[PDB]
Design an enzyme around this catalytic site. Structure first.
Site, PDB file in Angstrom:
ATOM      1  N   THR A 167      -2.562   0.115  -3.883  1.00 41.06           N
ATOM      2  CA  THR A 167      -1.904  -1.060  -3.335  1.00 41.06           C
ATOM      3  C   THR A 167      -1.845  -2.258  -4.255  1.00 41.06           C
ATOM      4  O   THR A 167      -2.764  -2.500  -5.025  1.00 41.06           O
ATOM      5  CB  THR A 167      -2.597  -1.513  -2.043  1.00 41.06           C
ATOM      6  N   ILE A 168      -0.749  -3.007  -4.142  1.00 43.40           N
ATOM      7  CA  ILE A 168      -0.696  -4.374  -4.677  1.00 43.40           C
ATOM      8  C   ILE A 168      -0.721  -5.408  -3.544  1.00 43.40           C
ATOM      9  O   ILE A 168      -0.443  -6.576  -3.768  1.00 43.40           O
ATOM     10  CB  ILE A 168       0.547  -4.624  -5.585  1.00 43.40           C
ATOM     11  N   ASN A 169      -1.098  -4.952  -2.344  1.00 47.51           N
ATOM     12  CA  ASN A 169      -1.249  -5.774  -1.143  1.00 47.51           C
ATOM     13  C   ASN A 169       0.068  -6.092  -0.438  1.00 47.51           C
ATOM     14  O   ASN A 169       0.676  -5.196   0.146  1.00 47.51           O
ATOM     15  CB  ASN A 169      -2.077  -7.026  -1.395  1.00 47.51           C
ATOM     16  N   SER A 188     -10.598  -4.054   2.661  1.00 45.30           N
ATOM     17  CA  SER A 188      -9.346  -3.311   2.736  1.00 45.30           C
ATOM     18  C   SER A 188      -9.246  -2.503   4.004  1.00 45.30           C
ATOM     19  O   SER A 188     -10.224  -1.940   4.464  1.00 45.30           O
ATOM     20  CB  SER A 188      -9.258  -2.322   1.573  1.00 45.30           C
ATOM     21  N   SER A 189      -8.029  -2.401   4.516  1.00 49.33           N
ATOM     22  CA  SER A 189      -7.698  -1.496   5.606  1.00 49.33           C
ATOM     23  C   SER A 189      -7.531  -0.040   5.198  1.00 49.33           C
ATOM     24  O   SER A 189      -7.452   0.827   6.050  1.00 49.33           O
ATOM     25  CB  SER A 189      -6.392  -1.953   6.235  1.00 49.33           C
ATOM     26  N   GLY A 234      -0.308  -1.858   6.821  1.00 53.14           N
ATOM     27  CA  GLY A 234      -0.895  -3.158   7.035  1.00 53.14           C
ATOM     28  C   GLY A 234      -2.307  -3.014   7.524  1.00 53.14           C
ATOM     29  O   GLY A 234      -3.081  -2.186   7.036  1.00 53.14           O
ATOM     30  N   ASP A 243      -6.612 -10.828   0.568  1.00 51.04           N
ATOM     31  CA  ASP A 243      -7.423 -10.011   1.460  1.00 51.04           C
ATOM     32  C   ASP A 243      -8.857 -10.509   1.635  1.00 51.04           C
ATOM     33  O   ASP A 243      -9.610  -9.948   2.428  1.00 51.04           O
ATOM     34  CB  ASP A 243      -7.421  -8.537   1.019  1.00 51.04           C
ATOM     35  N   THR A 265       0.845  -1.198   0.000  1.00 51.18           N
ATOM     36  CA  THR A 265       0.000   0.000   0.000  1.00 51.18           C
ATOM     37  C   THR A 265       0.870   1.234   0.000  1.00 51.18           C
ATOM     38  O   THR A 265       1.950   1.209   0.514  1.00 51.18           O
ATOM     39  CB  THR A 265      -0.947   0.078   1.232  1.00 51.18           C
TER      40      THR A 265
HETATM   41 CL   LIG Z   1       3.230   5.205   1.646  1.00 54.55          CL
END
Ligand SMILES: [Cl-]
Ligand SMILES: *[C@@H]1O[C@H](CO)[C@@H](O)[C@H](O)[C@H]1NC(C)=O
Ligand SMILES: *[C@@H]1O[C@H](CO)[C@@H](O)[C@H](O)[C@H]1NC(C)=O
Ligand SMILES: *[C@@H]1O[C@H](CO)[C@@H](O)[C@H](O)[C@H]1NC(C)=O
Ligand SMILES: *[C@@H]1O[C@H](CO)[C@@H](O)[C@H](O)[C@H]1NC(C)=O
Ligand SMILES: *[C@@H]1O[C@H](CO)[C@@H](O)[C@H](O)[C@H]1NC(C)=O
Ligand SMILES: *[C@@H]1O[C@H](CO)[C@@H](O)[C@H](O)[C@H]1NC(C)=O
Ligand SMILES: N[C@@H](CCC(=O)O)C(=O)O
Lengths: 189, 343
Positions: free
Chosen positions: A19-21, A71-72, A94, A43, A1
């Site tokens: 993000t790419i996780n 997602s967070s 995270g 996820d 992220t």
């Molecule tokens: Cl960042």
């Protein structure tokens, strides 16, 4: 992220989290295009996968075709009653993104820390499960003590907790900060 | 001490070079969205471990003229052949092609640029094309990520191709060049987003994902759509409003955390002594615990009904009910917070 924050001269603003996780996503890079593919499927929750001792999977976040996983991330923009932007903030890192974004806001909006301090100030995290409070290594140790006497179990983050990029309106204009934990700096005019 | 205050405009990205690239877009007449896109393209290079055109994003956008906020949802989506029981371990859900969801990034940039762009599409790519070819010294964050994953990186030669020097991961300061992605960025600049989803890059994307054991097809790419959300989540905080994305993102959790805490009326005094400070931080952790109890009911609202959950999570009254269960002198076991997996 990765999080970034933007305010333009006309006062319009963008808060963007991308993000790419996990680190390097799926670890699949195209030898032809050079694209590094996400592992966003991780996820979702799966009935077959246990991620924490005693934590059951969450049916609401099960895989279905065409569905987006939970997602967070939470790219945020705070605007004042007069229509002018006050804060542009978000985070990466995270599960700690949401709590770190809350802290940045609390730090600036309520404790009165200026944007750089709000970004640089030590953070802590608790997400109910695991049943532990993680604190960064330079947190005020009176806080650690206050938590333990109230029966929290604390543990020290091996590295750092999240990464926050922020912009806040001040009398002198737009104050911006990037998080030293990841090595950024802002730019403007 | 390291402050940066600007009279006219600012970009805060996680690499200085990308902040400058965003800043220059603004200075050349770009919208905030132009600047964000230009900067995002750069971060995908300089912090390639963390984001890029193989991923997805969300943008929260505020227009100061109309005083309206909107959200653009361009998060990845499970491919059409995906199913609930497709993974039987964590490693399966995390590594290789089967772990890949349909990338939304470029399409997110397109929709945002369509609605709010001022600079030409190609202009947004030019600085990053150059950067990927010229190369750049590896920054702090990427270096630590390289070290963290050195084993996997060093054992997979298509990654070592770019992320290693002499079989070992690049270190901070050493030059990273990304010549294939530069060409790909150029194609995107010239042919547009269509090149990714339904054009010259598409067959190769599918081939790379399936070769790594994935199931993304051309149809998944052709059909991907970024979504405009005209009414994002908000809460009042005093005289302000806070705009954030709802489910499938964590706005609802953030909203609940802040609504719990706002009833304590924190100020500078809340951290002026060790006694006050300790209680304030305890209260924060307890707000986290309550908010996370409720998080497990969330999911994509196109597939699950989260209307009532989110309504509770953003209600000040619900929050006040949770705040009243926060004990000043102790934390509690898990069940006290009533975590919930079903409504
Ligand atoms: Cl960042
Ligand atoms: C996991 O098990 C299910 C049930 O047998 C199966 O359909 C699926 O293909 C398996 N997945 C992997 C990656 O082995
Ligand atoms: C902001 O809103 C005004 C009025 O609808 C519109 O003309 C303008 O293009 C918007 N700005 C951007 C960057 O989209
Ligand atoms: C482009 O889209 C059309 C229909 O949307 C499809 O028939 C065609 O095969 C697509 N091309 C690529 C390269 O995906
Ligand atoms: C916040 O809550 C809902 C969002 O749909 C809406 O009724 C209200 O107008 C929003 N408020 C602002 C200030 O945008
Ligand atoms: C919303 O909150 C009320 C208490 O204020 C509770 O009775 C109700 O069950 C909650 N709804 C959901 C879906 O959790
Ligand atoms: C979690 O931590 C608290 C903190 O003291 C403790 O009361 C509880 O027994 C722990 N375990 C569970 C399952 O809550
Ligand atoms: N990619 C990790 C998230 O979206 O939270």
């Amino acid at each position: 992220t990765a999080h970034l924050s933007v305010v333009a001269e006309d006062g319009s603003a963008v808060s963007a989290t991308s993000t790419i996780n996990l680190y390097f996503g799926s670890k699949v890079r195209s030898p032809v295009s050079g694209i590094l593919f996400n592992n966003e499927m991780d996820d979702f929750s799966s009935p077959s996968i246990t991620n924490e001792f005693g934590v059951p999977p969450s049916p609401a976040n099960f895989i279905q075709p065409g569905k987006q996983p939970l997602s967070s991330m939470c790219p945020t923009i705070m605007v004042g009653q007069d229509g002018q932007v006050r804060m542009v903030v978000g985070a990466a890192g995270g599960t700690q993104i949401t709590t770190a974004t809350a802290l940045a806001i609390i730090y600036n909006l309520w404790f009165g820390y200026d944007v750089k301090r709000a970004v640089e100030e030590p953070r802590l995290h608790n997400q109910l499960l695991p049943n532990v409070t993680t604190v960064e290594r330079n947190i005020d140790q009176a806080v650690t003590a206050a938590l333990e006497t109230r029966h929290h179990h604390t543990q020290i983050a091996s590295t750092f907790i999240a990464v926050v990029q922020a912009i806040v309106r001040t009398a002198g204009g737009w104050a911006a900060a990037s998080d030293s934990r990841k090595g950024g700096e802002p730019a403007g005019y | 001490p390291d402050n940066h205050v600007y009279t006219r405009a600012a970009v805060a990205a996680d690499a200085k070079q990308c902040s400058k690239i965003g800043r220059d877009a603004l200075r050349d007449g770009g919208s905030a969205v132009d600047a964000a896109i230009a900067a995002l393209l750069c971060v995908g290079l300089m912090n390639a471990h963390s984001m890029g055109i193989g991923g997805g994003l969300f943008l929260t956008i505020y227009n100061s003229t109309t005083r309206k906020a909107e959200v653009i949802n361009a998060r990845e989506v499970a491919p059409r052949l995906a199913f609930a029981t497709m993974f039987n371990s964590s490693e399966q859900s995390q590594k290789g092609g089967l772990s890949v969801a349909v990338p939304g990034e470029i399409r997110g940039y397109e929709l945002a640029h369509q609605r709010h762009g001022r600079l030409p599409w190609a202009r947004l790519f030019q600085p990053s094309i150059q950067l990927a070819r010229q190369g750049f010294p590896v920054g702090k964050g990427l270096a630590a990520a390289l070290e963290n994953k050195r084993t996997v990186i060093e054992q997979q030669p298509v990654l070592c191709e770019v992320f290693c020097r002499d079989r070992k991961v690049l270190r901070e300061g050493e030059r990273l060049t990304l010549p294939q992605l530069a060409d790909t960025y150029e194609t995107l600049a010239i042919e547009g987003a269509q090149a990714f989803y339904n054009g010259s890059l598409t067959a190769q994307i599918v081939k790379d994902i399936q070769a790594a054991g994935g199931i993304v097809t051309a149809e998944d790419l052709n059909n991907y759509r970024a979504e405009l959300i005209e009414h994002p989540l908000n809460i009042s905080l005093g005289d302000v409003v806070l705009y954030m994305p709802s489910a499938p993102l964590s706005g609802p959790v953030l909203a609940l955390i802040l609504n719990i805490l706002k009833g304590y009326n924190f100020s500078r005094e809340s951290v002026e002594s060790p006694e006050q400070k300790g209680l304030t931080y305890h209260r924060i952790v307890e707000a986290f615990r309550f908010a996370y109890a409720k998080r497990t009911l969330l999911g994509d609202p196109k597939f699950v009904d989260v209307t009532e959950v989110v309504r509770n999570m953003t209600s000040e009254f619900f929050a006040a009910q949770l705040r009243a269960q926060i004990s000043d002198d102790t934390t509690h076991p898990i069940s006290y917070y009533k975590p919930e997996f079903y409504t």
